[PDB]
Amino acid sequence: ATFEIVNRCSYTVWAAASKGDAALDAGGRQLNSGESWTINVEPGTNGGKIWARTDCYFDDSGSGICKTGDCGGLLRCKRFGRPPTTLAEFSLNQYGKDYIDISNIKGFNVPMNFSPTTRGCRGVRCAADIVGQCPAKLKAPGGGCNDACTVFQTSEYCCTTGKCGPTEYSRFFKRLCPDAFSYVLDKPTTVTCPGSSNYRVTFCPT
């Protein structure tokens, strides 16, 4: 499948693409305002994620640091990124279907639209001002709005027993972005698309 990743933000972001134990395509790249990056993702890929990173510094060897979404100090991510990170999530070619979603389970840094560029399903978006409205205890100094699991490390926020309910904090994310996951056992906002669809991820869509 092909993904086109577009930065519509007025600031630079460093895009990242990983399946947790490996890069997808090159794994990461700088995107100035308006730039597009096209990647290829192997059919059958289960548990892929795309995210933006903010305020990065890299040397010539591709080693450095980002304020949100850092993946072990690398430009080309092999692993998932440090919260807070708005996440585009996908599993492809699973018994003839693709499954996509946006998640706030690991917090929010940048607004996002995740849409098919082929026919047969709809897209999803979280584009509200979550950082501006973020509750004081969840604000990250580096930028962004952390989830409650990352901050407080309780069984209820992290859903460690497989039983948990919504919380004051999960309800904040859900109020601003109904079409994204707000906690592990949220009613699913997953979209089912035809197998082998192609997609576009747009940062700062509005």
Ordered list of secondary-structure elements with their pairings:
Layout: E1 2-7, E2 13-18, E3 23-31, E4 36-40, E5 48-58, E6 64-68, E7 87-94, E8 97-103, E9 112-116, E10 124-126, H1 130-133, H2 148-152, H3 155-158, H4 168-176, E11 191-194, E12 199-203
Parallel strand pairs: 1-12
Antiparallel strand pairs: 1-4, 2-3, 2-5, 5-6, 5-7, 7-8, 8-11, 9-10, 9-12
InterPro entries: Osmotin/thaumatin-like_sf, Thaumatin, Thaumatin_CS
Pfam families: Thaumatin
Subcellular location: Cytoplasmic vesicle
Can you characterise this structure?
The chain is globular. The two termini are 25 Å apart. The strands form two sheets. Strands 2, 3, 5, 6, 7, 8 and 11 form a seven-stranded antiparallel sheet that branches. Strands 4-1-12-9-10 form a five-stranded mixed sheet, with no helix packed on it. Strand 2 (13-18) and strand 3 form a beta hairpin. It has one domain (1-206): Thaumatin (Sandwich), CATH 2.60.110.10. The chain has 206 residues and is mainly beta. Helices cover 11% and strands 36% of the residues. The chain is built from four helices and twelve strands; from the N terminus they run E-E-E-E-E-E-E-E-E-E-H-H-H-H-E-E. The longest helix is centred in the last third of the chain and has 9 residues, at 168-176. It comes from Thaumatococcus daniellii. This is Thaumatin I. One of its GO terms (cellular component) is cytoplasmic vesicle. Belongs to the thaumatin family. Its main location: cytoplasm. The PDB classes it as plant protein.
In short:
The protein is built from 4 helices and 12 strands. The chain is mainly β. The chain is globular.
